[PDB]
Coordinates of C-alpha atoms in Angstrom, one line a residue:
Chain A
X1 CA -13.8 5.3 -22.2
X2 CA -11.6 7.9 -24.4
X3 CA -12.5 9.6 -27.7
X4 CA -11.5 11.5 -30.3
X5 CA -10.7 14.8 -28.3
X6 CA -8.8 17.2 -30.3
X7 CA -4.8 18.1 -29.7
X8 CA -4.0 20.7 -27.1
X9 CA -3.1 24.3 -28.5
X10 CA 0.8 23.9 -28.2
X11 CA 2.1 20.3 -29.0
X12 CA -0.2 19.0 -31.7
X13 CA -0.6 15.5 -29.6
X14 CA -3.9 13.7 -28.8
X15 CA -2.1 12.1 -25.9
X16 CA -0.7 15.4 -24.0
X17 CA -4.5 16.6 -24.2
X18 CA -5.3 13.9 -22.4
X19 CA -3.0 14.5 -19.7
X20 CA -4.0 17.6 -19.3
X21 CA -7.3 16.8 -19.5
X22 CA -6.8 14.2 -16.7
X23 CA -4.7 16.7 -14.2
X24 CA -7.7 18.7 -14.5
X25 CA -9.7 19.3 -11.2
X26 CA -13.3 19.9 -11.2
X27 CA -13.2 21.8 -14.3
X28 CA -10.5 23.9 -14.0
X29 CA -8.5 23.6 -17.2
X30 CA -5.9 26.8 -18.3
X31 CA -4.5 26.2 -15.1
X32 CA -3.6 22.5 -15.4
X33 CA -1.9 23.6 -18.9
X34 CA 0.3 25.6 -16.9
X35 CA 1.4 22.7 -14.9
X36 CA 1.4 20.3 -17.9
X37 CA 3.4 22.2 -20.2
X38 CA 5.2 23.7 -17.2
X39 CA 6.3 20.1 -16.0
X40 CA 7.5 19.9 -19.7
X41 CA 9.9 22.6 -19.0
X42 CA 11.3 20.9 -15.9
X43 CA 11.9 17.6 -18.2
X44 CA 13.9 19.5 -20.7
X45 CA 15.9 21.1 -18.1
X46 CA 16.8 17.5 -16.3
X47 CA 17.2 15.7 -19.7
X48 CA 18.3 17.9 -22.8
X49 CA 15.7 15.6 -24.6
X50 CA 12.3 16.4 -26.2
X51 CA 9.6 16.4 -23.4
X52 CA 6.7 15.5 -25.4
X53 CA 8.7 12.5 -26.6
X54 CA 9.9 11.6 -23.3
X55 CA 6.4 11.7 -21.9
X56 CA 5.3 9.1 -24.8
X57 CA 7.9 6.7 -24.0
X58 CA 7.2 7.2 -20.2
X59 CA 3.6 6.5 -20.3
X60 CA 4.1 3.5 -23.0
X61 CA 5.9 1.8 -20.0
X62 CA 3.6 2.5 -17.4
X63 CA 1.0 1.4 -19.8
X64 CA -0.1 -2.0 -18.2
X65 CA -1.0 -5.1 -19.7
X66 CA -3.0 -7.2 -17.3
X67 CA -5.4 -6.6 -14.3
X68 CA -7.7 -8.0 -12.0
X69 CA -11.4 -7.5 -11.4
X70 CA -13.6 -8.6 -8.2
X71 CA -16.4 -10.9 -9.4
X72 CA -19.3 -12.3 -7.4
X73 CA -20.3 -16.1 -8.1
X74 CA -22.9 -17.4 -5.8
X75 CA -21.2 -15.8 -2.6
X76 CA -19.0 -12.8 -2.9
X77 CA -15.5 -11.6 -3.9
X78 CA -13.2 -13.6 -6.6
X79 CA -10.0 -12.2 -8.1
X80 CA -10.5 -12.4 -12.0
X81 CA -7.3 -11.9 -13.9
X82 CA -8.0 -10.1 -17.3
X83 CA -6.1 -8.4 -19.9
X84 CA -5.8 -5.0 -20.8
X85 CA -6.0 -3.5 -24.3
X86 CA -6.8 -0.6 -26.3
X87 CA -7.7 3.0 -24.9
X88 CA -8.0 1.3 -21.5
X89 CA -4.3 1.0 -20.8
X90 CA -3.3 4.6 -22.4
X91 CA -6.0 5.8 -20.1
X92 CA -5.1 3.6 -17.0
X93 CA -1.3 4.8 -17.3
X94 CA -2.0 8.7 -17.2
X95 CA -4.6 7.7 -14.5
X96 CA -1.6 6.7 -12.5
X97 CA 1.0 8.8 -13.5
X98 CA -0.7 12.1 -12.4
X99 CA -2.7 10.1 -9.7
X100 CA 0.3 8.9 -7.7
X101 CA 2.1 12.6 -8.5
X102 CA -0.9 14.0 -6.3
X103 CA -0.8 12.0 -3.2
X104 CA 3.0 12.8 -2.5
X105 CA 5.6 15.1 -0.4
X106 CA 7.5 17.6 -2.2
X107 CA 5.8 20.7 -2.7
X108 CA 4.2 21.5 -6.3
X109 CA 2.6 19.4 -8.9
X110 CA 4.4 20.9 -11.7
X111 CA 7.5 19.2 -10.0
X112 CA 5.8 15.9 -8.8
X113 CA 4.9 15.5 -12.5
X114 CA 8.2 15.9 -14.1
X115 CA 9.4 13.5 -11.2
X116 CA 7.3 10.9 -12.1
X117 CA 7.4 11.5 -15.9
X118 CA 11.0 11.2 -15.7
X119 CA 11.3 8.0 -12.9
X120 CA 8.7 6.5 -15.3
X121 CA 10.9 7.5 -18.2
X122 CA 13.7 5.6 -16.7
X123 CA 11.6 2.5 -15.7
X124 CA 11.2 3.0 -11.7
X125 CA 8.6 5.3 -9.5
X126 CA 5.8 4.3 -7.6
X127 CA 3.8 4.7 -11.2
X128 CA 5.4 1.9 -12.5
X129 CA 4.9 -0.1 -9.0
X130 CA 1.3 -0.6 -10.1
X131 CA 2.1 -1.7 -13.3
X132 CA 4.0 -4.9 -12.5
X133 CA 2.4 -4.9 -9.3
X134 CA -1.1 -6.3 -10.2
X135 CA 0.9 -7.8 -13.2
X136 CA 2.9 -10.0 -10.3
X137 CA -0.2 -11.2 -9.0
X138 CA -1.6 -11.8 -12.0
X139 CA 0.6 -14.9 -12.4
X140 CA -0.6 -15.2 -8.9
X141 CA -4.5 -15.4 -9.4
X142 CA -3.7 -17.2 -12.3
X143 CA -6.2 -20.5 -11.5
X144 CA -8.7 -18.2 -11.8
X145 CA -8.8 -17.3 -15.5
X146 CA -11.5 -19.4 -16.6
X147 CA -14.1 -16.9 -14.3
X148 CA -12.9 -14.8 -17.3
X149 CA -16.0 -12.5 -18.8
Chain B
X1 CA 36.8 -33.4 -26.0
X2 CA 39.0 -30.1 -26.8
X3 CA 37.8 -26.8 -26.8
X4 CA 39.2 -23.7 -28.6
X5 CA 38.6 -20.2 -28.2
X6 CA 38.5 -18.7 -31.8
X7 CA 37.6 -15.0 -31.2
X8 CA 37.3 -13.0 -28.4
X9 CA 35.5 -9.3 -28.7
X10 CA 35.1 -7.5 -25.3
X11 CA 32.5 -9.8 -23.2
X12 CA 31.6 -11.9 -26.3
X13 CA 33.6 -15.1 -26.6
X14 CA 33.1 -17.7 -29.2
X15 CA 34.4 -21.2 -28.3
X16 CA 34.9 -24.4 -30.6
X17 CA 34.1 -27.8 -29.3
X18 CA 35.5 -30.5 -31.0
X19 CA 35.2 -34.2 -30.3
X20 CA 35.5 -36.5 -32.7
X21 CA 37.4 -40.5 -32.3
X22 CA 35.6 -42.5 -30.1
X23 CA 33.6 -40.0 -27.9
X24 CA 31.5 -39.4 -30.9
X25 CA 30.6 -43.3 -30.5
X26 CA 30.3 -43.0 -27.1
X27 CA 27.4 -40.8 -27.7
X28 CA 26.4 -42.7 -30.5
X29 CA 25.9 -45.4 -28.0
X30 CA 23.9 -43.3 -25.8
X31 CA 22.2 -42.4 -29.0
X32 CA 21.2 -45.9 -29.8
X33 CA 19.8 -46.3 -26.4
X34 CA 17.7 -43.7 -26.1
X35 CA 16.5 -44.0 -29.5
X36 CA 15.8 -47.9 -28.8
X37 CA 13.8 -46.3 -26.1
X38 CA 11.5 -44.5 -28.5
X39 CA 9.5 -45.1 -31.6
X40 CA 9.8 -48.5 -33.5
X41 CA 9.4 -50.2 -37.0
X42 CA 8.3 -53.2 -38.5
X43 CA 11.9 -54.7 -37.7
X44 CA 12.6 -55.4 -28.9
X45 CA 15.7 -54.1 -27.4
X46 CA 17.8 -55.6 -30.2
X47 CA 18.2 -53.0 -32.8
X48 CA 21.8 -52.3 -33.6
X49 CA 23.2 -49.0 -35.3
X50 CA 22.6 -49.8 -38.8
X51 CA 19.2 -50.2 -38.6
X52 CA 18.2 -47.0 -37.7
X53 CA 19.9 -44.4 -40.0
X54 CA 18.8 -46.4 -43.4
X55 CA 15.4 -45.6 -42.0
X56 CA 14.5 -42.4 -39.6
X57 CA 17.1 -40.9 -42.0
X58 CA 19.1 -38.0 -40.9
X59 CA 17.3 -37.8 -37.4
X60 CA 19.8 -40.0 -35.9
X61 CA 22.4 -37.3 -36.6
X62 CA 20.5 -34.6 -34.7
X63 CA 19.8 -37.0 -32.0
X64 CA 23.4 -37.8 -31.7
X65 CA 25.0 -34.5 -31.5
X66 CA 22.3 -33.8 -29.0
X67 CA 24.5 -35.8 -26.4
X68 CA 27.7 -34.6 -27.9
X69 CA 26.8 -31.2 -26.9
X70 CA 25.4 -32.5 -23.4
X71 CA 29.7 -32.7 -22.7
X72 CA 29.6 -28.6 -22.8
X73 CA 27.7 -27.4 -20.2
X74 CA 29.9 -28.3 -17.7
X75 CA 32.6 -26.3 -18.8
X76 CA 30.5 -23.4 -18.7
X77 CA 28.7 -23.0 -15.2
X78 CA 31.0 -21.5 -13.2
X79 CA 30.9 -18.6 -15.8
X80 CA 28.2 -16.0 -15.3
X81 CA 26.5 -15.0 -18.8
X82 CA 24.3 -12.2 -19.8
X83 CA 23.0 -14.0 -22.3
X84 CA 22.2 -18.0 -22.5
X85 CA 24.7 -19.2 -24.9
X86 CA 24.4 -19.9 -28.3
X87 CA 25.3 -22.6 -30.7
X88 CA 26.4 -20.8 -34.0
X89 CA 27.4 -23.7 -36.1
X90 CA 27.3 -27.6 -35.4
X91 CA 28.0 -30.6 -37.5
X92 CA 29.0 -34.3 -37.5
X93 CA 31.3 -36.3 -39.4
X94 CA 31.6 -40.2 -39.3
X95 CA 35.0 -39.6 -37.2
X96 CA 35.3 -36.4 -36.0
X97 CA 32.6 -33.6 -34.7
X98 CA 32.8 -30.1 -34.0
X99 CA 30.2 -27.6 -32.7
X100 CA 30.8 -23.9 -31.9
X101 CA 28.9 -21.7 -29.1
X102 CA 29.0 -18.1 -28.8
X103 CA 29.5 -17.2 -24.8
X104 CA 28.6 -13.5 -23.8
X105 CA 30.1 -13.5 -20.1
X106 CA 28.9 -10.5 -17.9
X107 CA 30.5 -6.9 -19.3
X108 CA 33.4 -5.7 -17.7
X109 CA 32.6 -2.3 -15.5
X110 CA 34.1 0.6 -14.6
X111 CA 32.9 2.9 -11.9
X112 CA 34.0 6.5 -11.4
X113 CA 33.8 8.0 -7.8
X114 CA 30.3 8.0 -6.6
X115 CA 31.0 11.5 -5.0
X116 CA 30.5 13.1 -8.7
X117 CA 26.4 12.9 -9.0
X118 CA 24.1 15.0 -7.1
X119 CA 20.8 14.0 -5.7
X120 CA 18.3 16.5 -4.8
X121 CA 16.6 16.5 -1.2
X122 CA 14.1 19.3 -0.2
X123 CA 14.5 21.0 2.9
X124 CA 13.1 18.8 5.8
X125 CA 12.8 21.1 8.7
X126 CA 11.7 23.7 6.0
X127 CA 9.1 21.3 4.7
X128 CA 7.5 20.2 7.6
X129 CA 6.7 23.6 9.1
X130 CA 4.9 23.6 5.6
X131 CA 3.1 20.4 6.5
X132 CA 2.1 21.3 9.8
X133 CA 0.8 24.8 8.7
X134 CA -1.4 23.5 6.3
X135 CA -2.5 20.2 8.2
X136 CA -3.7 22.5 10.9
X137 CA -5.6 24.6 8.6
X138 CA -7.3 21.5 6.9
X139 CA -7.8 20.4 10.7
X140 CA -9.4 24.0 11.3
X141 CA -11.9 23.6 8.4
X142 CA -13.0 20.2 9.6
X143 CA -13.7 21.6 12.9
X144 CA -15.5 24.5 11.3
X145 CA -17.4 26.4 14.0
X146 CA -20.9 27.1 12.6
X147 CA -24.3 29.0 13.4
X148 CA -27.6 29.0 11.7
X149 CA -28.4 31.9 9.3
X150 CA -31.4 33.7 8.2
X151 CA -29.6 35.2 5.3
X152 CA -29.1 34.3 1.6
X153 CA -27.0 31.7 0.9
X154 CA -23.9 34.2 0.0
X155 CA -20.3 32.3 -0.5
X156 CA -18.4 30.9 2.4
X157 CA -22.0 29.8 4.3
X158 CA -22.6 26.2 4.5
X159 CA -26.1 25.0 3.1
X160 CA -27.5 21.7 3.5
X161 CA -30.2 20.7 1.1
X162 CA -32.3 17.3 0.8
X163 CA -32.2 16.1 -2.7
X164 CA -34.9 13.9 -4.2
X165 CA -34.8 12.3 -7.5
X166 CA -38.2 11.5 -9.2
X167 CA -39.1 9.0 -12.1
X168 CA -40.0 10.4 -15.3
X169 CA -43.7 10.4 -14.0
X170 CA -43.5 10.8 -10.5
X171 CA -42.2 7.7 -8.7
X172 CA -39.4 9.2 -6.2
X173 CA -36.4 6.8 -6.5
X174 CA -33.9 8.1 -4.0
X175 CA -33.1 11.2 -1.0
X176 CA -30.4 11.8 0.3
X177 CA -29.6 15.3 2.5
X178 CA -26.3 16.6 1.0
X179 CA -24.3 19.7 2.5
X180 CA -22.1 22.3 0.8
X181 CA -19.9 25.2 1.7
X182 CA -20.2 27.6 -0.9
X183 CA -17.0 27.9 -2.6
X184 CA -16.3 32.0 -3.1
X185 CA -18.5 32.2 -7.0
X186 CA -18.3 28.6 -7.8
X187 CA -19.9 26.8 -11.0
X188 CA -19.9 23.1 -9.0
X189 CA -23.0 21.1 -9.7
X190 CA -26.2 22.0 -7.9
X191 CA -24.4 24.3 -5.6
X192 CA -24.4 27.1 -8.3
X193 CA -28.2 27.3 -7.9
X194 CA -28.1 27.1 -3.9
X195 CA -26.0 30.1 -4.2
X196 CA -28.2 33.1 -3.0
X197 CA -31.0 31.1 -1.3
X198 CA -32.5 31.2 1.8
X199 CA -34.0 28.0 3.9
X200 CA -37.0 26.5 2.6
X201 CA -36.5 27.2 -1.1
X202 CA -36.5 24.5 -3.7
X203 CA -34.9 24.3 -7.0
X204 CA -35.8 21.9 -9.5
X205 CA -33.7 20.3 -12.2
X206 CA -35.0 18.2 -14.9
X207 CA -32.6 15.6 -16.7
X208 CA -32.8 13.3 -19.7
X209 CA -30.8 10.0 -19.6
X210 CA -31.1 7.3 -22.7
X211 CA -34.5 8.5 -23.5
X212 CA -36.1 8.7 -19.8
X213 CA -36.6 11.8 -17.9
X214 CA -35.8 12.4 -14.2
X215 CA -36.3 15.1 -11.9
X216 CA -34.2 16.1 -9.1
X217 CA -36.1 18.5 -6.3
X218 CA -33.4 20.1 -4.2
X219 CA -35.0 21.5 -1.1
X220 CA -32.8 23.8 1.0
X221 CA -33.0 22.8 4.7
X222 CA -30.8 25.4 6.5
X223 CA -28.2 27.4 6.1
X224 CA -25.4 27.9 8.7
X225 CA -22.7 30.3 9.2
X226 CA -19.3 29.5 9.1
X227 CA -16.4 30.5 10.8
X228 CA -13.3 28.5 11.1
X229 CA -12.2 28.5 15.0
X230 CA -8.9 29.9 16.1
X231 CA -5.6 28.2 16.0
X232 CA -5.4 27.9 20.0
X233 CA -5.2 25.2 22.7
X234 CA -8.7 24.5 22.0
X235 CA -8.1 23.5 18.8
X236 CA -6.3 20.6 20.2
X237 CA -8.9 19.4 22.5
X238 CA -11.3 19.6 19.5
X239 CA -9.3 16.6 18.2
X240 CA -9.8 14.2 21.2
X241 CA -7.4 13.4 24.3
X242 CA -3.7 12.9 24.8
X243 CA -2.8 16.7 23.6
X244 CA -3.5 19.2 26.2
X245 CA -1.8 22.2 24.1
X246 CA -1.3 23.5 20.8
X247 CA 2.5 23.3 20.7
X248 CA 1.5 19.4 21.5
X249 CA -0.9 18.8 18.7
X250 CA 1.8 20.4 16.2
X251 CA 4.3 18.0 17.9
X252 CA 2.1 15.1 17.1
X253 CA 1.8 16.4 13.2
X254 CA 5.5 16.9 12.9
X255 CA 6.2 13.4 14.1
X256 CA 3.4 12.6 11.4
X257 CA 5.0 14.4 8.8
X258 CA 8.9 13.2 9.2
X259 CA 7.3 9.7 9.0
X260 CA 5.9 10.3 5.6
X261 CA 8.9 12.1 4.6
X262 CA 11.7 10.0 5.6
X263 CA 9.6 7.3 3.4
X264 CA 8.9 9.4 0.4
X265 CA 11.9 11.7 0.1
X266 CA 14.4 8.2 0.8
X267 CA 12.4 6.9 -1.8
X268 CA 13.1 9.5 -4.3
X269 CA 16.7 10.3 -3.7
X270 CA 17.2 6.5 -4.7
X271 CA 15.5 7.0 -7.5
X272 CA 17.6 9.9 -9.1
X273 CA 20.7 7.8 -7.8
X274 CA 19.4 5.0 -10.1
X275 CA 18.7 7.4 -12.9
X276 CA 22.2 8.8 -13.3
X277 CA 24.6 5.6 -12.6
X278 CA 25.3 5.7 -16.6
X279 CA 27.1 9.1 -16.1
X280 CA 30.1 7.5 -14.1
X281 CA 29.9 4.1 -15.6
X282 CA 31.6 2.8 -18.5
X283 CA 31.6 -0.8 -19.5
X284 CA 33.5 -3.0 -22.3
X285 CA 30.4 -5.1 -24.2
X286 CA 30.5 -6.5 -27.2
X287 CA 28.4 -4.5 -30.0
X288 CA 26.8 -7.7 -30.7
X289 CA 25.8 -8.5 -27.5
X290 CA 23.7 -5.3 -27.5
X291 CA 22.6 -5.6 -30.9
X292 CA 20.8 -9.2 -29.7
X293 CA 19.2 -7.8 -26.3
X294 CA 17.9 -5.4 -29.1
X295 CA 16.3 -8.0 -30.9
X296 CA 15.8 -10.0 -27.6
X297 CA 13.6 -7.2 -26.8
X298 CA 12.0 -5.5 -30.0
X299 CA 10.4 -9.0 -30.9
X300 CA 9.2 -9.7 -27.3
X301 CA 7.2 -6.3 -28.1
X302 CA 5.3 -7.5 -31.1
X303 CA 4.4 -10.6 -28.5
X304 CA 1.9 -8.0 -27.3
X305 CA 0.8 -5.9 -30.4
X306 CA 2.7 -3.2 -28.6
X307 CA 5.8 -2.9 -30.8
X308 CA 2.9 -1.1 -33.9
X309 CA 1.7 1.7 -31.8
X310 CA 5.3 2.1 -30.1
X311 CA 7.2 2.2 -33.5
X312 CA 4.7 4.3 -35.3
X313 CA 5.8 7.6 -33.0
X314 CA 9.6 7.6 -33.8
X315 CA 10.6 9.3 -37.1
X316 CA 12.0 5.8 -38.5
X317 CA 11.9 2.6 -37.2
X318 CA 16.2 2.5 -37.1
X319 CA 15.3 5.7 -34.7
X320 CA 13.8 3.8 -32.2
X321 CA 16.1 0.7 -32.3
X322 CA 18.5 3.6 -32.0
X323 CA 16.9 5.0 -28.9
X324 CA 16.2 1.3 -27.8
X325 CA 19.7 0.3 -27.9
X326 CA 21.5 2.9 -25.7
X327 CA 18.2 2.8 -23.4
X328 CA 19.5 -1.1 -22.5
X329 CA 23.2 -0.3 -22.1
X330 CA 22.3 2.2 -19.6
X331 CA 19.9 -0.1 -17.7
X332 CA 22.8 -2.8 -17.8
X333 CA 25.4 -0.6 -16.7
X334 CA 22.9 0.1 -13.8
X335 CA 22.1 -3.8 -13.2
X336 CA 25.4 -4.4 -13.5
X337 CA 27.0 -1.7 -11.1
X338 CA 24.5 -2.9 -8.4
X339 CA 25.1 -6.8 -9.0
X340 CA 29.0 -6.0 -8.5
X341 CA 29.4 -3.4 -5.4
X342 CA 27.1 -5.8 -4.1
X343 CA 29.7 -8.5 -4.2
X344 CA 32.6 -6.3 -3.4
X345 CA 30.7 -5.4 -0.1
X346 CA 29.5 -8.8 0.6
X347 CA 26.1 -7.2 0.4
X348 CA 23.1 -10.1 0.3
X349 CA 19.5 -10.7 0.7
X350 CA 19.1 -13.7 3.0
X351 CA 16.0 -16.1 3.0
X352 CA 14.7 -14.4 6.1
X353 CA 15.0 -11.0 4.7
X354 CA 13.2 -12.3 1.7
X355 CA 10.4 -13.1 3.5
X356 CA 10.4 -9.8 5.5
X357 CA 9.6 -7.9 2.3
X358 CA 7.1 -10.3 0.8
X359 CA 4.9 -9.6 3.5
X360 CA 5.1 -6.0 2.7
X361 CA 3.4 -6.7 -0.6
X362 CA 0.6 -9.1 0.7
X363 CA -1.5 -6.1 1.5
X364 CA -1.2 -4.7 -2.2
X365 CA -1.3 -7.8 -3.9
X366 CA -5.2 -7.9 -1.6
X367 CA -3.8 -11.4 -0.3
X368 CA -3.4 -13.4 3.0
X369 CA 0.5 -12.7 4.1
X370 CA 1.0 -16.5 4.2
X371 CA -0.4 -17.2 0.4
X372 CA 2.7 -14.6 -0.6
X373 CA 5.3 -16.7 1.6
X374 CA 3.4 -19.8 0.0
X375 CA 4.2 -18.6 -3.8
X376 CA 7.7 -17.3 -3.0
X377 CA 9.1 -20.7 -1.5
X378 CA 7.1 -22.4 -4.2
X379 CA 7.9 -20.3 -7.0
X380 CA 11.8 -19.7 -8.0
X381 CA 10.7 -16.9 -10.6
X382 CA 8.7 -14.4 -8.5
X383 CA 11.2 -15.4 -5.7
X384 CA 14.1 -13.9 -7.7
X385 CA 12.5 -10.8 -9.0
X386 CA 11.7 -9.9 -5.4
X387 CA 14.8 -11.2 -4.5
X388 CA 17.2 -8.6 -6.6
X389 CA 15.0 -5.8 -6.0
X390 CA 15.5 -5.9 -2.4
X391 CA 19.3 -6.1 -2.7
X392 CA 18.9 -3.3 -5.2
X393 CA 17.3 -1.0 -2.6
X394 CA 20.0 -1.8 -0.4
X395 CA 22.9 -1.2 -2.6
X396 CA 21.6 1.9 -3.8
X397 CA 21.3 2.9 -0.1
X398 CA 24.6 2.5 0.4
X399 CA 26.0 4.2 -2.3
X400 CA 23.5 7.5 -1.3
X401 CA 26.2 7.7 1.4
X402 CA 28.6 8.9 -1.1
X403 CA 26.8 10.9 -3.2
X404 CA 26.6 15.1 -3.3
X405 CA 22.9 15.6 -1.6
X406 CA 22.0 18.9 -3.0
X407 CA 19.3 20.7 -0.5
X408 CA 16.6 22.6 -2.1
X409 CA 14.1 24.9 -0.1
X410 CA 10.2 24.7 -0.7
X411 CA 8.6 26.4 -3.6
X412 CA 5.3 25.5 -2.4

């Protein structure tokens, strides 16, 4: 999953393109744009720093390193901790920044987004809870690393 | 033993431990005993001092000091350190000995009027109305009032199809009746084709997946007319017993929202108060203490390959290290400000309460509540990571009572 999709029209970054590409609902692009580039506008207001750069370091932080996948070895349901590298993580983060921003209170999504990207930027927010959350039960389900695939 | 402080650099202090005379020998003894309890030579238990050094050349020396140093930790145990003591230089002469450790005490804080920083809150009453208004509206849609229609399937009707998928030569594989609400001019899969269709019509769509063709026969089963029921006391009835009046359903839904708000918004304020401690914080910290934590971090990045990507997005590695520096300084400020005020106010997370949160993470972890408690009593690593966080979310809470809560009205 994830391929060499070309940068968004404004910032020449493959990643922001993937972010827009994620927030998208159904196929409604050119709307998500207005959010993403807009959450970038709020972010420079609430930091006075380069958003594209904040975004990077924010996603970088949410990038997890391990996870757990359910298995079945005769019976059913076994917790297998596995490592997470390559496009998987980079995607998994976005898939979380954005995903958590959705299920919120607030009002708009442009705002919810800035709110995560910034909190994540400062190593807090539900975004990151998922990160270190599995990660804690990574060293909980430790004893089942031999079921690894 | 004899300890003297060479230099003091804010929180960085360096100690000189000079032993010598006889306690050098008293260790030398301890050295001989423990050593005589290990590897042996073509020389049981009777080997004196000579033997050793004229054989396991040098090592002896090492192992000696190792017992000399033992006499240090008990000078430094009633001091809290932001960085485990690091032994700069060590050396052993026949008569005297000298060890030098560098100590990094916790850096001195200076707060500055918690009332100065502002956090944002969205108008509660005015966001709940927004909530209910939209909740009811979503409740209507679910209780869509519909009646069969004989027209074409213009937008806003509900068509119900039965989709059958055939194998590349007939073998029918699946059958499932889906139903859709036609969205005002939509390019949704399948549905765009059901647009303008009347009952009993079929829409075939063929498709190829890794060589094999698969057919999809979609048959329109029925087309109803949607008209959402009006917001009355009848809408309440429509969602079960208990509520008899609309004003009553709304009540319930408000209560349901204040719930979700009080949790989500409280958490937000916390979050942003934390984002902002460093503004009002100022600490005395040795440049070197930082510069270390910097390496103590950069390195620990190369331990997952991460450093390579990470570095390769800033102008120069020196600018990263530079961003990474202040990044930590700010956190320690925070962390520090928390830890401090937690003592000044006697705030502490007790055993009984440390379990109380642990059971809150049992569902998310996907484990039995008891396995958590098993892991917390047993481990002293998840125990403390969990512990402090709990205290943190407490100290923040307190502080949130002094900050300037700026209230904003909903935009969406």
